[PDB]
Design a protein around this ligand. Structure first.
Ligand SMILES: Cc1ccncc1NC(=O)CN1C(=O)COc2ccc(Cl)cc21
Ligand SMILES: Cc1ccncc1NC(=O)CN1C(=O)COc2ccc(Cl)cc21
Lengths: 304, 304
């Protein structure tokens, strides 16, 4: 028992981290097979970042301008290309530590682990959710660009995120591994509206189920609700409307605990309307939304 | 910017995890050089656990009864010995993935990362603190025994914890890597009092400094306090008394922000007495104590 914000073991991803330098800019790159992926803004100076013409900036660069170093050793760059907001540097050596991997575009509300890196060296690992507005609330500093987000299914690493920037509001934005930004963001130093965010309802309900499994049950009540009634409350409190697909994904947790999904919705309704009255749930004094129903099942079953 | 409960990258520790089986019990072991360390209760059956005579139980075991498997391959056991509550199994092969390492006994209030494992396979990584009462609030299930806690200083892994048991209260207890339990616990299935716990004051103050660095500053006030006055409040709210050694450890954070330690103590005093009035600090609705002043400095500087 016990429930923690757990990240996937980062070993398979640590083996892929490299440092990429172009001119005076150094950031992180991901070396998979004979290709190194990194944010295309590695080719900019600070002066270029207000409105960079990436196509023109990249034309001034040759393979030998991209310095790629895998810890101690230097990689030989034999090709370079830009795909959306990422650069792909072809190297003459396939990474011997390349794990089985996939590139995936995650849905808002899904979670993943981030291996924060600086100068190609891993500094720490944390779990987070892709917000409904396609931002992530990470922990990143200057030099963290190129750090990646991922999930692991037994021996396969599905890379879903590459870090690009911090918005003026302190939140984070990035791309999938094909260089497409999540959300409306562009890789330019401009103020950028991140949409209205909402709380990931299906994940809060999953976390209330994790709470019951682990013995925190004070919030359970004698009530039930309907999807319509619950959604009027979700509306008022800026929670994502609950759908039958979310109820379906919560089936395994409802089966394990014997608590019907709509009954858990009535506990969440009372918590939204009344607050937590100075009490905690799984060590938190707020409703947590960074655990998916899959995360709860994985953590509560002991999947490796 | 941003502040997360970040764990150390687990790669160096994943390389050391093995499965240890003795009879019908399987748990995790730590393979460093030519020795595998694991909880001594691997030699018990469920019947033995009410009051095991470990010396007698171990005399019934020979080297060949300890099945050690490093993922796919089997290790040959050439010696076994019990040191406090750990077994040390000498193997004929030194672990080729052994990192630079140390065994350390951590102080209560210090933090570390845990790589939760099942059947010798890593399942996830999370950061936690050793509570003042020498328990840890982890996330562990049956089979997690032998999972380790550690910290990393550049290339050196300091192992500080090995998981042994869950107390009837759902909290966790374990040993240093010499097999000495943290706290008054014994490796026996008996109800065991974990002392009165307290909140780690120096870590809450470190986290309020992390909040200011990251822009959360609503809790700052026009007041100051003294160590004596602050300690009367710490007493009432079950917080550890603050000492000059804690103020000294907070020096770098006070220097970075320009907020004197006693002025931050006055913000913490007002938060203890008034609560957070429905507001949050770094995404938390309670006062967080799982970040040491070293953790805050490391996270806010980008140490790899
Ligand atoms: C400093 C920091 C902290 C956390 N995560 C990332 C960063 N770094 C950046 O954001 C880099 N960067 C700027 O600093 C400003 O101009 C930009 C415009 C576009 C893009 Cl892609 C990057 C930038
Ligand atoms: C189940 C679980 C969940 C989380 N962490 C650990 C465990 N496992 C245990 O605690 C094993 N175990 C018992 O189950 C009961 O008897 C004991 C007495 C002493 C010692 Cl050392 C171990 C045990």
């Amino acid at each position: 028992s016990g429930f923690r914000k757990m990240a996937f073991p980062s070993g398979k991803v640590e083996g892929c981290m490299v440092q990429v330098t172009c001119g005076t800019t150094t950031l992180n790159g991901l070396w998979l097979d004979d290709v190194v992926y990194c944010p295309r803004h590695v080719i900019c100076t600070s002066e270029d970042m207000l409105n960079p013409n990436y196509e023109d900036l990249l034309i001034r660069k040759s393979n030998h301008n991209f310095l790629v170093q895998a810890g101690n050793v230097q990689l030989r760059v034999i090709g370079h290309s830009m795909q959306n907001c990422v650069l792909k540097l072809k190297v003459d050596t396939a990474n011997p530590k390349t794990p089985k991997y996939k590139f995936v575009r995650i849905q808002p509300g899904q979670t993943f682990s981030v291996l924060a890196c600086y100068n190609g060296s891993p500094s720490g690992v944390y779990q987070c959710a892709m917000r409904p507005n396609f931002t992530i609330k990470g922990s990143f500093l200057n030099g963290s660009c190129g750090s990646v987000g991922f999930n692991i299914d037994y021996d396969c690493v599905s890379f879903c995120y590459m870090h690009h920037m911090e918005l003026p509001t302190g939140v984070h934005a990035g791309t999938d591994l094909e260089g497409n930004f999540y959300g409306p963001f562009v890789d330019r130093q401009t103020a950028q509206a991140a949409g209205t965010d909402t709380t990931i309802t299906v994940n809060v309900l999953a976390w209330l189920y994790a709470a019951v499994i682990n013995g925190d049950r004070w919030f359970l009540n004698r009530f039930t609700t309907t999807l319509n009634d619950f959604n009027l409350v979700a509306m008022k409190y800026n929670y994502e409307p609950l759908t039958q697909d979310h109820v379906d994904i919560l089936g395994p947790l409802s089966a394990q605990t014997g608590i019907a999904v709509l009954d858990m919705c009535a506990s969440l309704k009372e918590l939204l309307q009344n607050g937590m009255n100075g009490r905690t749930i799984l060590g938190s004094a707020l409703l947590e939304d960074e655990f998916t129903p899959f995360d709860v099942v994985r953590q509560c079953s002991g999947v490796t």
